[PDB]
């Protein structure tokens, strides 16, 4: 299209592949993690990004993902050492406050709820855990959820409600919520459509839609239909049902490892194993039951190896960050 | 990607490019002498790897290995494919995308074995296992 994806900065720091990047809630700081078992916190000084602090010795194995609390004071890191660590600054220096254990195997993902009072993890052991966050060293396990039949890749909390979405090697996405009467966490829905591993999931602004990305080289848009919906979608269990209302096919050569839906612009970014970053925008005339999403720009050689993650800046509209197996982090500006 | 470039268009980057490299034989030489985990023979001697089951394009940083387990219920199929992955990871420059798949129709569980071998996250976790990496290095080392 007429859009453009412009490179602004290229950063390294880590030795080896970089698995994840995560913007701080205020957009002038981000964290990165990788194979080298370190977390790096980067900050903007003028027009130059640089590593401000390095968090080593928190994990004995690969760090797969980091996410900031919504308040920006806490960082959670998920590691192949079967633990999740929580970091915060109280002395002026980031320190590890607590370590959450319990998974049998590698922890793949971590996610904070909107209020910051809940924390979710998922593992190669096929389970999803939900923790209640009550203090800097005060965590109680609220649920251990085993609906998935294979390694669980990602967990993402709903932007408005305490709904948890999980994506799995078993090709499905699942939705969790507290049962009203007794407040037990249970599985509310299963999203079936992808023909291979679901790597990434992200909600749109109001949380009424979800975008997923898969080893099957497609991304899908899911819409939620609540009981009593006008559209006539059946809700037999009196639960919200999600239906695949759009599939974007033929745009990715290899597995799509991450997808990010910008709450400020509504743009969708994908990270692909073919080294490409692609940007999608909803069509002006698209119908809510059959939306159309068009690629407005791309950078097919964005990195020199697989792109592992793409993340929209939560404050700076149109600013994107990516990281790659090539050992680089890149910061981009998208113009429509 | 996926759907090909419209035939009427040529990629501008490509046009300028058009304006020594790895071949099947070189790749075959890298993996033909990998040892079987259980037997004192090479993957070539067991008909597990063959030159004609190798596909490579240097310019597009891609190599594809098809391997044939010795039996349709082979319990070592993932370990064999993983040893191929490790060999090519070390020997080839890091730009290369390596795909290792069971030859179609030659294993009762080929879909599930292929899916594991193609999951770079699970492969990376597996290669952090000191025991597994040791066994794989044993298989790879030529004699
Ligand atoms: Na508290």
UniProtKB/Swiss-Prot annotation, chain A:
Post-translational modification: Conjugated to URM1, a ubiquitin-like protein.
Each WD repeat, start to end: 13-52, 58-97, 102-141, 147-186, 193-232, 251-290, 302-336
GO cellular component, as recorded: cytosolic [4Fe-4S] assembly targeting complex; metallochaperone complex
SMART domains, sorted: WD40 (SM00320)
Cystine bridges: none
Family membership noted in the UniProt record: Belongs to the WD repeat CIA1 family.
Name of this chain's protein: Probable cytosolic iron-sulfur protein assembly protein Ciao1
Swiss-Prot record, chain B:
Gene Ontology terms: biological process: cell division; chromosome segregation; protein maturation
InterPro entries membership: FSCA_dom_sf, MIP18, MIP18-like
Pfam family name, one: FeS_assembly_P
Cellular component aspect of the GO annotation: cytosolic [4Fe-4S] assembly targeting complex; metallochaperone complex
Disruption outcome: Embryonic lethal. In 0-2 hr embryos, mutants display signs of incomplete chromosome segregation during mitotic divisions likely due to defective organization of spindle microtubules.
Gene3D superfamilies: 6.10.250.1280, Fe-S cluster assembly (FSCA) (3.30.300.130)
Annotated keywords: Cell cycle, Cell division, Chromosome partition, Mitosis
Family of the protein in this entry: Belongs to the MIP18 family.
Function: Component of the crb-galla-Xpd (CGX) complex which is essential for proper mitotic chromosome segregation in early embryos. The CGX complex is also required for cell proliferation in developing wing disks. In the CGX complex, acts with crb to recruit Xpd thus forming the functional complex.
Known partners and oligomeric status: Component of the CGX complex composed of crb, galla (galla-1 or galla-2) and Xpd. Interacts with crb (via intracellular domain). Also able to interact with Xpd in the absence of crb. Interacts with Mms19.
Other comment: The name 'galla' means splitting in Korean and is derived from its role in chromosome segregation.
Protein name in the entry: MIP18 family protein galla-2
Species of origin: Drosophila melanogaster
